[PDB]
Amino acid sequence: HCPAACTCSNNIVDCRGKGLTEIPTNLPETITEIRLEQNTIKVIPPGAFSPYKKLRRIDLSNNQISELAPDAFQGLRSLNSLVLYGNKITELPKSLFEGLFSLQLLLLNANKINCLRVDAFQDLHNLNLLSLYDNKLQTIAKGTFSPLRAIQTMHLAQNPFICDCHLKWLADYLHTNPIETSGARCTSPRRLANKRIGQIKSKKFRC
Numbered sequence: 001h002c003p004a005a006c007t008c009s010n011n012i013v014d015c016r017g018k019g020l021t022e023i024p025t026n027l028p029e030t031i032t033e034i035r036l037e038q039n040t041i042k043v044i045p046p047g048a049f050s051p052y053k054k055l056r057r058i059d060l061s062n063n064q065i066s067e068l069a070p071d072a073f074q075g076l077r078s079l080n081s082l083v084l085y086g087n088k089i090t091e092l093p094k095s096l097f098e099g100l101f102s103l104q105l106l107l108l109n110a111n112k113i114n115c116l117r118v119d120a121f122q123d124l125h126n127l128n129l130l131s132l133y134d135n136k137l138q139t140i141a142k143g144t145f146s147p148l149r150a151i152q153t154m155h156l157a158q159n160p161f162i163c164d165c166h167l168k169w170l171a172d173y174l175h176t177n178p179i180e181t182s183g184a185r186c187t188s189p190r191r192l193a194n195k196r197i198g199q200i201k202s203k204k205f206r207c
Helices: 168-176
Strands: 007-009 012-014 033-035 057-059 081-083 105-107 129-131 153-155 186-188
Touching: none
Parallel strands: 012 033, 033 057, 057 081, 081 105, 105 129, 129 153
Antiparallel strands: 007 012
16 A cells, blocks of 8 residues: 555655656555655646545655646645645646645746636635746736735746736735745836836836
C-alpha cells in the first residue's frame, strides 16, 4: 500500500525525489498528506486524489505536469494546501478547484498559465495565500477575487500584465487590500512598463 520507493508513516506518503513518472495508486484511504514533489509526473488523471478524502496537504511541485483532469481534486473538502508550483500547467480546467472549501494555501507559481476563468477560485472562501507568480497572465478579469473572503497574501508578479482599463479594478482592489507582496508590475503599455501595479494611481489604467 506504500510504494516501494517511498516512505509512509503517520498518514503521510512521502515520495519526494524518487523518480516517479506517475501518481502511485492504491494508497491507504486514511492518508492526510501526499508528498509527490520533485518527480517527473506529467498527467493528473481523472479523480486522481478522489479516493483520499482525508487529505489535507498535496505537494505536486517540481514535476512536469502539463495536464490536469478537471475532477483531479473532487471531494477533497478537508484539503488545506495544494502545492503545484514548478510545473508546465497552461490552463486551469473548469471546476479544478471546485468544492475545496477548506483550502488555505494554493501555489500555482512558476507555470505557463495564460488565463484565469472568473470562477477559477469560486469555492476558495477560506484561502489565505494564493500564488500566481511567474505565469503568462496578461490580465485578471474583474470578479476573480470576489470569492476570496479570507485572502491575506497574494504573489502575482512575473506576469506580463497589461495595465489597461480592464486591470483597473486590480489597482483599486490592491489600494483597498495591499496584500500583493512580490512586487507585481505592468509590462504594457510602454508608458507603465515595469512599474509596480501598487504604485500606480487607478486613473492611469485606461483603454
